[PDB]
Amino acid sequence: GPLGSMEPPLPVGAQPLATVEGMEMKGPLREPCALTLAQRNGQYELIIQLHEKEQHVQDIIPINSHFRCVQEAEETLLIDIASNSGCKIRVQGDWIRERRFEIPDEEHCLKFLSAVLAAQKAQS
Numbered sequence: 001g002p003l004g005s006m007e008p009p010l011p012v013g014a015q016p017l018a019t020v021e022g023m024e025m026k027g028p029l030r031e032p033c034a035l036t037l038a039q040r041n042g043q044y045e046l047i048i049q050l051h052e053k054e055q056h057v058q059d060i061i062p063i064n065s066h067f068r069c070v071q072e073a074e075e076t077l078l079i080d081i082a083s084n085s086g087c088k089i090r091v092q093g094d095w096i097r098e099r100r101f102e103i104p105d106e107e108h109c110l111k112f113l114s115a116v117l118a119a120q121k122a123q124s
Helices: 105-123
Strands: 015-027 029-040 044-048 057-062 068-071 085-094 098-103
Touching: 015 044, 015 105, 029 098, 029 105, 044 105, 068 105, 085 105, 098 105
Parallel strands: none
Antiparallel strands: 015 029, 015 098, 029 044, 044 057, 068 085, 085 098
């Protein structure tokens, strides 16, 4: 019913815990995107989707020490929700040097931040 006529863009094995629409900002320019948290193989992983004109690029960014989500701060992994209402976060790790992301949808931001925060909180 809720599923589309064709397999979803996200991995089949992946279990999208939460899905939200955000915007990826980069020094030279920005580009609309979407942040989706999913659990695969009993592990937590964050998938970043870019609304690229060509095709939705699938970026697999596993959640762990290498992956960090800082909410408008140098390193505020413990707290992220406190800064609701248009939340801006930054991701840095082996997969990517540094990229910015934002979610203007507060209601959606709560689920995204809560799910992602819980994932990192549980790991560390």
